[PDB]
Amino acid sequence: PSLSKEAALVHEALVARGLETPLRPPVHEMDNETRKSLIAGHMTEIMQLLNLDLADDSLMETPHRIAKMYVDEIFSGLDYANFPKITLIENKMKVDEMVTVRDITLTSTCEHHFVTIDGKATVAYIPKDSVIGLSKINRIVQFFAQRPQVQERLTQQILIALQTLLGTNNVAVSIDAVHYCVKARGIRDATSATTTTSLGGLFKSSQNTRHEFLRAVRHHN
Amino acid sequence: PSLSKEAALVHEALVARGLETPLRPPVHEMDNETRKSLIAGHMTEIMQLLNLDLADDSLMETPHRIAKMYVDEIFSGLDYANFPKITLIENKMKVDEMVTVRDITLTSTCEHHFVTIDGKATVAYIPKDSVIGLSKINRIVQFFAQRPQVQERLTQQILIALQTLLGTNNVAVSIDAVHYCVKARGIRDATSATTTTSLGGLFKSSQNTRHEFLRAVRHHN
Amino acid sequence: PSLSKEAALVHEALVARGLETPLRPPVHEMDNETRKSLIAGHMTEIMQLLNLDLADDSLMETPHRIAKMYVDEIFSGLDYANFPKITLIENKMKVDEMVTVRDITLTSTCEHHFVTIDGKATVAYIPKDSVIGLSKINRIVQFFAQRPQVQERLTQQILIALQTLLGTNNVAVSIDAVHYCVKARGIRDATSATTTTSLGGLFKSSQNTRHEFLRAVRHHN
Amino acid sequence: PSLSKEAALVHEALVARGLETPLRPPVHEMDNETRKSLIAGHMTEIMQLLNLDLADDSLMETPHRIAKMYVDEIFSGLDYANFPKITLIENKMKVDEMVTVRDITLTSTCEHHFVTIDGKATVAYIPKDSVIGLSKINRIVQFFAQRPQVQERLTQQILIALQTLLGTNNVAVSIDAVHYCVKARGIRDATSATTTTSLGGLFKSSQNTRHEFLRAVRHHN
Amino acid sequence: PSLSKEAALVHEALVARGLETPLRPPVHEMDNETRKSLIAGHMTEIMQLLNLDLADDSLMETPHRIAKMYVDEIFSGLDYANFPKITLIENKMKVDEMVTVRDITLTSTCEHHFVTIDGKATVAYIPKDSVIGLSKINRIVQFFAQRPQVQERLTQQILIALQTLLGTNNVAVSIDAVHYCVKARGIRDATSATTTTSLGGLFKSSQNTRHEFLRAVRHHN
Amino acid sequence: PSLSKEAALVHEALVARGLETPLRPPVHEMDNETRKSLIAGHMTEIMQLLNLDLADDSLMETPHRIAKMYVDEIFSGLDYANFPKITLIENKMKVDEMVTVRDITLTSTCEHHFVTIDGKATVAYIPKDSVIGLSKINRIVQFFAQRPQVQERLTQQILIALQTLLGTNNVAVSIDAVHYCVKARGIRDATSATTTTSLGGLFKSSQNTRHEFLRAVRHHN
Amino acid sequence: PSLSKEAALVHEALVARGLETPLRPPVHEMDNETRKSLIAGHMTEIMQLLNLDLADDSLMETPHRIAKMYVDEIFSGLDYANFPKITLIENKMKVDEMVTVRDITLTSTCEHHFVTIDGKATVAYIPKDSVIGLSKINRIVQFFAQRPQVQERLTQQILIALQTLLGTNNVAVSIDAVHYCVKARGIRDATSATTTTSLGGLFKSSQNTRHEFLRAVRHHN
Amino acid sequence: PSLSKEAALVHEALVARGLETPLRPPVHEMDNETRKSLIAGHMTEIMQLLNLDLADDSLMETPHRIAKMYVDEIFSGLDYANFPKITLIENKMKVDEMVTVRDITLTSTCEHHFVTIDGKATVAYIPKDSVIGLSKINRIVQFFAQRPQVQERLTQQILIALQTLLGTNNVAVSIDAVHYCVKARGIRDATSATTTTSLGGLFKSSQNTRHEFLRAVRHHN
Amino acid sequence: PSLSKEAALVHEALVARGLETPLRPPVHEMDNETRKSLIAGHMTEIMQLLNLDLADDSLMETPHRIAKMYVDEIFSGLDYANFPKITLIENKMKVDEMVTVRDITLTSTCEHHFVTIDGKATVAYIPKDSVIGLSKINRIVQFFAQRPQVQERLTQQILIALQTLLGTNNVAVSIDAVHYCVKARGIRDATSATTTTSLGGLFKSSQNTRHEFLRAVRHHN
């Protein structure tokens, strides 16, 4: 009817921990269509302020493309109506060891300059009552990634969302990414990459479990 | 006469632990030949529903090829009459350290979409009374891989099968694989890979042994 | 109203050259919904013939998942209603040298066994009157790849589709892919890869141009 | 009834060119079973001459294992009754550019010492009236590889067999391999590898075509 | 006069531990010359049973070449008359840390099928009263490698031989090898490799020393 | 008005620990302009002593270029008026795990010969009350790098500056670099590189945390 | 007595072509000792202008160290008294093919900023009447490298020096280097590298010879 | 009786071309035993001149070891009595394309300083009437390598020896090597390597053949 | 006046521990010039015994070159008059963590055959009262490397020399090298490398420190 049981749960969990993305309730019920047009409008003004000849065929549709990109694509994660459908199967296999999904493609945006964050996430968890569909993990990562982020927050959000859905605190998330906020401009460091990890349950308590995960983290190319 | 002592033991072990692949007893004794033909028929219908011109020389034999592939090849692991012949030699060498067989080629099928799972397995065990033929390890892995799987279950099954045959709980199995269920369709993540491990005996108890194995797991290319 | 001007053109071009995928006209106007359900039914029967216990939570939804994957995903390319929207900008830059888009991710299906084909395509063309949006090239490749293919045909189709849309014969397509039809079963060759190329215009005529393209073809990892 | 049309053709072609493996007609019609037993007997004698304690469980079955390996496995190519089934589809795609199958796994035996030859073959051909199933190429390479060989002969044999089956002289075969005949014993050169190529049709005549193929030959790891 | 003090010691040590290669005392004092000729004879028969035309110049000398290879080369390790001369210098340097010799080239034969085993050994030891010439370590490895082996036994044998000669139990041997018994035939796994280790003294007792060695084990290419 | 609160704090902290770069108070208030001209003058004399023909168009502006490089570029870190603007956000994410910024491009000058030091730094810290902007870390590293350094001091300085700004002693800095002071002249060692680390807080106290950081240190290329 | 016949020849050759480093005749005969002291003085002033506390033990000797480095090391190539001794042997081997010395370590200084240039040179020549000692080539490269350079000139100088000494115009020189002038400061491009080549004789005339050389140029790491 | 027909032929061919190693006829028929002892004596004197305490157990046997190494090992190539036995088989395969043996391990000695030369040779030839045993090529290379060499001569010698034995001028030899004469001392260039090639027949005449060979030359690691 | 304070200290330290290279006091005060000439003479005789035509221009100067190489270059470490000048700066930085200088180029000679040893050393130490110039470490390594060595001794010598000069026992030295004594001759193992380590102070006592060092030891290429 609006948000799925999962979307609701995850959202509440995040709000409770104070880990939700800084959002303000919708001032007025606007259709995404009207928001897009308004954003497109402001973009048109910014491009004109930059002295771009909006009459050019190639630049003409840009304000609209950017508006759609924001509302529908790169910032779609802000709307829980886009939360993926979660499928869980009973842990009949009686798995008691961690399942690790590595090198998940992740593309996000640094909220301080609205510039690309390109990286990879490694998620691992120890199955309790249910096992989650591998694809679902990738989708959850993408969801939170599609928001104006701060890697420190992004990692935390993914962790909690998964803990909530899997019903286990034994979840670990590690994200290694390149920030164009740092590379493409400013200090323009062409080689640095940032790594942030958030560990829950045994992954934080048990040094044994913690290190097994950390050792598995990151690969090459 | 039907199933070898080994095939029987392994099958029982799996059923006991409740780790056997979800199978229903044969409704009627059909020849694999009749099953193949029946499967071929259903495929013919599916292809027709997809509007494929089955009159084309290249597509003509597909329903049969698929049927044979299923029954004889990719799902042959479901029939214990195909279980490999196990050869064990007396551990006169008095080996007390683990023997590791790494990078075993593994090709399986994700049962949720019947799509390719391509990866590699690393198996290790500490010889007790007998040492197994290296090739047999690769064969057992392939056997269980030739079934509609769920990586979490596949890893478990191989572990138990080996424990049963070697007569030692000191066995460890780690499988790293790419699921086309995730890559080729759905979220289409082109870089993620899943790693699952199942540890028995000392490999689970002894942190020392456990880490020695984990440290050896995985290589490159 | 049905097919876009582009979809129609490409389809006609393919039929004219006799390079279209072997298709029979829809016997009856069935909703994709009814086709999916029918396919799901045939799958149910096949799985039962394989003796799989469809009562298992994990296997239960498979017949439906496969049906949807076929109609909506992996074989969606058979329906021109799914042809991407093509955007072309005027070649005001007066580009006379080839534009190469390399390492396009490609996932298709070998029609002889309905098994995964995983590879990468390198497409190049010399802009005439218009320049195409880079993303569109990737999209066209994916479209044709989402069909029961034979690499030799796939390469040809992409070539013609591009030539038609760009209005230039100067297009070159090279595809390097691994066939699980070969790796996962049958001879089980774990290392072979197939490369097929289709050259048009100067890429075939001019040895100079031809080699410049070929030299650029393929990379590593 | 005995040999397939294909097996016969290929065999004749090889005999005609005087490129067949040095074989003598079967002195007497012996069952492979009796041959294996005889070979096993000779091996038993050789092992005893080496002073190996054949009473040892590990060595006990070796004479039989070696006999079966020779007759059924590594030298099976000597019997045309094992020639693969060739599937050819009409070249409706009108492919006029070469199709290259690279990195075909190849394991053979150096006939001068009966020691392992491990390598990879690259085969390419320009489709005339028919296109061959990719897997079939790998199979044909394996067939001729499963014989006491001399790389110079092996490459020639594969070339001819393919030209004959495809009905085109435009075929090229290149094999790069490590001979344990050289590495494991004798001079014990741990790094050398031998590369041999055989070119037919345009691949030999047309310098353009020749170099395109040669440039594609060999990869890494 | 026959066997050196070293050869005798090592042989006795191996027989005591029951780690010697399964050998039967020479039934009759035969010259290696007569043994070679007899082996050559049996080989002639085997090749004839395989229907090879022994009249061919290339195949003609094979029976003799194989016989010499067996007796003089690949199985020479069976004769302690071929044991290397060991040179030991007084540990005046007062070395108390381990000396590691890595990537020792090792070529052996899997006794179950008489096929090539190609790998590399890493040997380490903590000097007590004497230091051994580095080359000697490679020679001892080669000696035991030149025998019909089972990697599990090979590793053990090298360990004991070294312990005996160095007069220290603090020796560690690790061998990583590819078995063509597995790759070239049978299951034909093109990627798996086996690793076996045998640890003596501190390398087994001291977890600290043990891991330092294990961490050093294996390199790339 | 002169130095920012941050610049002042950091400077004081360094002086307090006695880790500041050996500086003498400005003998007289000179404009950077006059300093540059004076430096350029001395360089002119040096070049003349080296017998370089300063009348050459290429060498003519060198004295000035060097002077500007020293004052404005490579030694600009000596003037705290160039200290970066630090942005800190409240640690609302409640991050308790370390944030690692790896492969920070670092170019400094070995004060003993005024020759290039080219390397990379890895910085990590455990957020207390505030999280710092990733780029800022790179900037601080660059700041101190832009001074006549001694890697041992450089590492210490970056550590302290960070501890001061973040208000946490839990900071770790590791720098790996190539000194042309060693490579380009003198002993001319073309392969050596120096690695220095400075650990604060838990990174020094907790062996667990210390090793997690060290394990993450350094990558390739 | 002063300059060797070789030094004289090379110097004259360069002067004639107008390729010599911009030098002014020594204004007065000063001992390198007095020049070093004078330079050291200028450096002391420059360091003081930078506000460096020369009282510090580490910085104290810097002015002298830099002065010695300039006169004796990095700029020693400016004095032909340092020209290496050239050894040539009669080309009795009758070599008519090119001899290539690749990956020659080269460290020079960009004269526009007096900053490090780190790279590698590849030199090749076709022996005429004499063959030069390989080491001598490396030495000649170093000689000219030890000067305030401009890569374009450096390459030309080495070419001519070699042509003169070898008595053959058939010489080719290629230098690939990284300029810290670009990396460490200014635009700070961390990845670019400059390649310059100078070709003499057949290496310029004969396209065949030219490309053979160029194809050989550059390697990795 | 002394020298084989092959050794004789090769020696004559070399002397004819004036490519033989500078040798003087044996002044007196001395046993290698007496020569070794004499050399050992001179070495004893040299070591004593270096002030080495020959009473030390480790240095004691050095003069003898060196003497034996010279006469029996590293310089054994000077004695044609050590020339390998050449085995040639009739080119019944009718090979008309070149056979390439790459990465042949080569270790020689730079005659100017008697220091190690470590490299790899790539040999190729077009079979005329006979095909040579692959191992023989490696052996011939080693033979000439075991002499005080100059890479330019070494390459020439191998070329001629092969041309003579194969009865074809179509032979090509390329040697890439590192000279410790350059690396370990003198200029101490840690990265340079020398490549020398000698081409015969078509490999020199036919630009097509020539480049095919050259393009194949050299690999990595 | 003869030996520096440092040279004397280091020499005494080594002699005290009995780790000095086996040397006999100079029998008579000979000029290095006369020693070189005497050595040259003995070499002349050795070359003549090898039947080398010393009249050849290329071989003519060899006896002298070798004599100079021995006395002035490769064995110059035997004379403490060649010990490097050590520069130490006060540890004002208050460095308490280890400084590691890795991949130090090392070229020595195996005293048992006087053949090249090519390797790399990794030296680390924890600064006490003074910090040493990085280059000095490389120089000290080279000094001891320039002597007839046994890797086991070489490592020990470097360790002690450093401990003595730095006034700290907290020094660790690890050397990984390839011995041509093993590769170029004798067993001719083309892949083995030896690794030796000597640990002082905390590097031996503290398992924590010990492992931090060991983990950092060795890199690739």
User: What is the three-state SS of B97-154?
Assistant: CCEEEEEEEEEEEECCCCEEEEEEEEEEECCCCEEECHHHHHHHHHHHHCCEECHHHH
Distance separating alpha carbons of residues F161 and D75, to the nearest angstrom? 73
Closest CA to A44 of A21, A19, A62, A70: A62
E46 sits in which H/E element = helix E32-49
Q: Is F41 helix (H, G, I), strand (E, B) or coil?
A: helix
Q: Is C214 helix (H, G, I), strand (E, B) or coil?
A: helix
- In D, which residues are within 8 Å of B87 by CB distance? 61
Closest CA to E87 of F64, I187, A203, A44: I187
The alpha carbon of H9 is separated from its chain's Cα centroid by a whole number of angstroms, namely 17
Q: Residues of B marked as binding for Zn(2+)?
A: 110, 113, 181
CB contact under 8 A, I138 and F190: no
- In D, which residues are within 8 Å of E24 by CB distance? 48, 51-55
DSSP state of D84: P
List residues in chain F that are followed by a break over 2.5 Å (C to N).
none
Distance separating alpha carbons of residues C163 and C129, to the nearest angstrom? 12
Distance separating alpha carbons of residues A37 and A30, to the nearest angstrom? 11
Q: Assess C89–A contact: CB distance below 8 Å, yes or no.
A: yes
Chain A closest-CA separation from residue B21 CA (Å): 10
Q: Is A21 helix (H, G, I), strand (E, B) or coil?
A: coil
- Tokens representing G122? 């590849």
Closest CA to B212 of B220, B221, B202: B202
Distance separating alpha carbons of residues H71 and E175, to the nearest angstrom? 35
Give the count of alpha carbons within 13 A of G39, CB side only. Answer: 23
Cross-chain CB nearest to D90 (options B57, B87, B90):
B57
Burial G6-26 (b: 16+ CB within 10 A, else e): bbebbbebbeeeeebbbeeee
- N-term to C-term CA, chain F: 43
Question: Do the beta carbons of residue B21 and residue B15 sit within 8 Å?
Answer: no
Distance separating alpha carbons of residues G148 and D97, to the nearest angstrom? 55
For testing the chain H interface, which of I30, I35, I51 should be mutated: the one with the most H CBs within 10 Å? I51
Specify burial of residue E49 (Cβ count, 10 A radius: 0-12, 13-18, 19+).
Answer: buried
Question: Do the beta carbons of residue G61 and residue G100 sit within 8 Å?
Answer: no
Q: Assess E152–D contact: CB distance below 8 Å, yes or no.
A: no
Torsion sign, CA atoms D20, D24, D25, D30? negative
Q: Is D11 among the annotated ligand-binding positions? A: no
For testing the chain E interface, which of B82, B93, B212 should be mutated: the one with the most E CBs within 10 Å? B93
**Could you confirm whether C181 is annotated as catalytic?**
yes
**Could you confirm whether E110 is annotated as catalytic?**
yes
Specify burial of residue D160 (Cβ count, 10 A radius: 0-12, 13-18, 19+).
Answer: buried
CB contact under 8 A, E134 and I193: no
Distance separating alpha carbons of residues B32 and E188, to the nearest angstrom? 26
Q: Is E64 among the annotated ligand-binding positions? A: no
Burial C148-176 (b: 16+ CB within 10 A, else e): bbbbbbbbbbbbbbbbbbbebbbbbbbbb
- Kindly list the domain boundaries of chain D, sorted by start residue: 1-85, 86-221
Closest CA to I93 of I131, I132, I136, I135: I131
Phi-psi region of F57 (alpha: psi -120 to 50; beta: other; left: phi over 0): alpha
In sequence order, the β-bridge partners of residue A171 are A125
| AA identity, residue A105 | T
**Could you confirm whether I151 is annotated as catalytic?**
yes
Chain A to chain B Cβ contacts (< 8 Å): 74
Question: Do the beta carbons of residue B123 and residue B157 sit within 8 Å?
Answer: no
Distance separating alpha carbons of residues C7 and C83, to the nearest angstrom? 6
The CATH class of D86-221 is alpha beta
Rounded to the nearest 5°, which phi and psi values hold at I26? Answer: -55, 110
F88 sits in which H/E element = strand F88-90
Distance separating alpha carbons of residues H101 and H88, to the nearest angstrom? 16
Give the count of alpha carbons within 13 A of I170, CB side only. Answer: 19
Q: Assess B150–A contact: CB distance below 8 Å, yes or no.
A: yes
Cα dihedral angle (F133, F137, F140, F145), rounded to 10 degrees? -160
Question: Do the beta carbons of residue B71 and residue B35 sit within 8 Å?
Answer: yes
Specify burial of residue G221 (Cβ count, 10 A radius: 0-12, 13-18, 19+).
Answer: exposed
CB contact under 8 A, C78 and B42: no
For testing the chain F interface, which of G31, G45, G72, G114 should be mutated: the one with the most F CBs within 10 Å? G114
- ∠ CA C156-C161-C162, nearest 5°, is 100
Distance separating alpha carbons of residues A141 and F24, to the nearest angstrom? 54
Catalytic residue among G110, G146, G149, G157: G110
- Tokens representing D40? 């096993």
Question: Do the beta carbons of residue A74 and residue C41 sit within 8 Å?
Answer: no
Question: Do the beta carbons of residue E42 and residue D41 sit within 8 Å?
Answer: no
Instruction: Write the CATH number of the domain with boundaries I1-85.
Output: 1.10.286.10
Distance separating alpha carbons of residues C175 and D25, to the nearest angstrom? 46
Residue D161's contacts (CB-CB under 8 Å, 6 or more residues apart) are D10, D13, D14, D140, D143, D144
Q: How far is CA E149 from CA D59, E118, E126, E176, E193, in A?
A: 10, 12, 27, 14, 16
Q: Assess E191–C contact: CB distance below 8 Å, yes or no.
A: yes
Q: Residues of A marked as binding?
A: 110, 113, 181
Helices (H) and strands (E) in chain F, counts: 9, 7
The nearest alpha carbon in chain E to B142 belongs to: E187
**Could you confirm whether A28 is annotated as catalytic?**
no
For chain G, helix, strand, coil in percent to 5 are: 45, 20, 35
Q: Assess I55–G contact: CB distance below 8 Å, yes or no.
A: no
Chain I closest-CA separation from residue D190 CA (Å): 7
Closest CA to I89 of I126, I124, I132: I132
**Could you confirm whether A181 is annotated as catalytic?**
yes
Distance separating alpha carbons of residues D154 and D150, to the nearest angstrom? 6
In sequence order, the β-bridge partners of residue B199 are B172
DSSP state of D117: E
Length of chain I, please?
A: 221
DSSP state of H84: P
Q: How far is CA C209 from CA C126, C200, C206, in A?
A: 10, 11, 5
How many C-beta neighbours within 10 Å does residue B9 have? Answer: 16
Question: Do the beta carbons of residue D88 and residue D131 sit within 8 Å?
Answer: yes
Distance separating alpha carbons of residues H36 and I46, to the nearest angstrom? 10
- Tokens representing B111? 């049962």
H10-18 contact pairs (CB < 8 A, 24+)? H10/H80, H10/H83, H10/H160, H10/H161, H10/H164, H10/H165, H11/H80, H13/H160, H13/H161, H13/H163, H13/H164, H14/H157, H14/H160, H14/H161, H17/G94, H17/H156, H17/H160, H18/G92, H18/G94
| AA identity, residue H1 | P
Q: How far is CA C216 from CA B108, C101, C172, D216, in A?
A: 35, 10, 12, 12
CB contact under 8 A, H95 and D196: yes
Distance separating alpha carbons of residues F120 and F108, to the nearest angstrom? 10
Question: Do the beta carbons of residue G58 and residue F112 sit within 8 Å?
Answer: yes
Distance separating alpha carbons of residues D148 and E68, to the nearest angstrom? 18
Cross-chain CB nearest to D19 (options H93, H133, H220):
H93
Give the count of alpha carbons within 13 A of E183, CB side only. Answer: 26
DSSP state of D119: E
Distance separating alpha carbons of residues I19 and F183, to the nearest angstrom? 30
Distance separating alpha carbons of residues H76 and H71, to the nearest angstrom? 6
Give the count of alpha carbons within 13 A of C117, CB side only. Answer: 29
**Could you confirm whether F28 is annotated as catalytic?**
no
Distance separating alpha carbons of residues A167 and F208, to the nearest angstrom? 28
Q: How far is CA H203 from CA C67, H13, H125, H138, I4, in A?
A: 61, 20, 9, 20, 61
- In E, which residues are within 8 Å of B127 by CB distance? 152
Catalytic residue among G142, G149, G151, G157: G151
Question: Do the beta carbons of residue G3 and residue G76 sit within 8 Å?
Answer: no
Distance separating alpha carbons of residues H79 and H76, to the nearest angstrom? 6
- Tokens representing G143? 């000689």
For testing the chain D interface, which of C192, C197, C207 should be mutated: the one with the most D CBs within 10 Å? C192
Distance separating alpha carbons of residues F85 and I101, to the nearest angstrom? 34
Specify burial of residue H88 (Cβ count, 10 A radius: 0-12, 13-18, 19+).
Answer: middle
Distance separating alpha carbons of residues E189 and B139, to the nearest angstrom? 9
- Tokens representing B141? 């892995």
Distance separating alpha carbons of residues H189 and G139, to the nearest angstrom? 9
Residues of B with active-site annotation = 110-113, 151, 179, 181
Any idea which residue has 């150096």 for tokens?
D110
How many C-beta neighbours within 10 Å does residue E191 have? Answer: 17
Closest CA to C158 of C130, C127, C125: C125
Chain A closest-CA separation from residue B134 CA (Å): 26
